[PDB]
């Protein structure tokens, strides 16, 4: 039969916004396929049907990324880094939608395919972070070792992708979007663990593996798994501030090179300016 040519691509551009539909059979997360029909024996035989099988995989990841969204903060901020990035993906979506509603449009199947092509590479590196992210959720006893090895694979992904590229810093910032935001609740417990003396660790999952023991003679026991000296400076300081609350006393990217271990070696004196000033008070 005849389906609408140059309008089914505006109707997949439809699907990519509102993700569950009837022109495209994305029934589940594992299988996302499209079937329109075979179209007629003149005027674009099968090329357009080959292009729809490509974008079937590109609506597949956004259905996977939305299925990851449900309604620690580290697992929630890693989820909101996905969603805060979506409005930068949804702004172009309204641009090409504004172009085709405005007559004349002067676009077709193929001349739009290079406009979303820089976005096409940006959405596939989104797939690699989240596919290497969740791999041990159907296994049980995930709690801290899943958090530790998905932060590890996030760090494994930023070593593989930023350090090899650097011709475009727009994706260099993008892999830093996924890093600086997940580490921020993993930071704000450390701020609470020093200047307030107490920390928050939930019971269903676990984080940095700091826990206070219930007896008074026991100080602090580090959980065994079943920069690191700067983390030991957090351990002794939060022990010492737990003591102190018990005591009653009285431009261009290529010149900025590169990138995340320089910012981390800025955070360690930021830890340091409290690790150096606590031990003076002890």
């Amino acid at each position: 039969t005849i389906v609408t040519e140059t309008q089914v691509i505006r109707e997949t551009l439809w699907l990519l916004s509102g993700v569950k539909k009837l022109l495209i059979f994305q029934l589940n997360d594992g299988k996302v396929n499209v079937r329109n029909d075979i179209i007629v024996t003149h005027m674009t035989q099968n090329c357009l049907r080959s292009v729809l099988e490509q974008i079937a995989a590109y609506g597949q990841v956004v259905f996977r990324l939305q299925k990851f969204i449900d309604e620690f903060r580290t697992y929630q901020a890693f989820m909101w880094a996905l969603y805060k990035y979506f409005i930068s993906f949804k702004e172009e979506l309204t641009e090409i939608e504004k172009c085709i509603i405005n007559k004349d449009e002067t676009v077709t199947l193929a001349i739009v395919l290079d406009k979303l092509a820089p976005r096409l590479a940006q959405l596939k590196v989104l797939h690699r972070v989240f596919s290497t992210g969740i791999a041990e959720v159907p296994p049980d006893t995930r709690n801290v070792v899943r958090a530790s090895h998905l932060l590890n694979t996030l760090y494994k992904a930023i070593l593989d992708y930023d350090n090899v590229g650097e011709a475009s810093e727009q994706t260099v910032s993008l892999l830093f979007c996924l890093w600086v935001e997940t580490v921020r609740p993993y930071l704000e417990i450390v701020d609470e663990w020093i200047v307030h003396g107490n920390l928050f660790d939930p019971a269903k999952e676990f984080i940095i593996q700091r826990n206070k023991d219930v007896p008074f003679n026991h100080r602090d026991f580090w959980y065994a798994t079943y920069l690191k000296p700067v983390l030991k400076q957090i351990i002794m300081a939060g022990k010492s501030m737990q003591l102190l609350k018990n005591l009653k006393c009285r431009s261009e990217s290529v010149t900025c090179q590169s990138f995340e271990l320089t910012l981390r070696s800025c955070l360690y004196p930021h830890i340091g300016k409290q690790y150096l000033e606590c031990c003076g008070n002890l």
Binding site: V180, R184, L187, E188, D191, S251, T255, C256, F259, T262, L263, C266, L267, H270
Partner: peptide, 16 residues
Amino acid sequence: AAAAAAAAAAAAAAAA
């Protein structure tokens, strides 16, 4: 001082 350490990191990125 949570985002403040990251704000100085982004300030050091523009000055690097």
